[PDB]
Amino acid sequence: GNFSQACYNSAIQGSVLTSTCIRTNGGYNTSSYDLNSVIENVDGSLKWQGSNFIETCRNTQLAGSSELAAECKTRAQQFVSTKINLDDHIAAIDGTLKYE
């Protein structure tokens, strides 16, 4: 992961991370990644190893340079605040965001 070490100007909109990432040989590339493919809402907590969190979470934002923050529903249908460190698994490879 550790995309924040290779990328700047990051943003979250919905479930999409956008960032400007350095290419292997010099310049930069504007990249995006749909985190809904790799993050699950498990009883109100954002977790890796699943998908589809955006269906039951709201108010997604980037906190700091690499944390996704949101408000997600528990199984009992109550919203709680939750965060996950995207640097755990999101990398930049030759300027493109990828899940590792």
Place this chain on the structure above:
Amino acid sequence: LGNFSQACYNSAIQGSVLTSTCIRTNGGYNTSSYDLNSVIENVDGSLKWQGSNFIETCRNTQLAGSSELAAECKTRAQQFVSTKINLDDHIAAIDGTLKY
């Protein structure tokens, strides 16, 4: 700058998914899909960017023209109204793949 439709053909919408066949940077074609539920919200019956999960409260999605998502979305008063959003605002063709 979005504008995928300038490089893409045979686009279709099914549920929240856009699929299109786009010309690659150096030639040939690639087909890819994009889950618009990641980045479009239903705000009181109107589709808007800067949110997510419109599909939960919208139905009858289709492609209008070459780049417009048309749908019927529920207002706060719980009635379906027609709405459209131009996917060229934010969806681009990047070397033949749809990206935000």
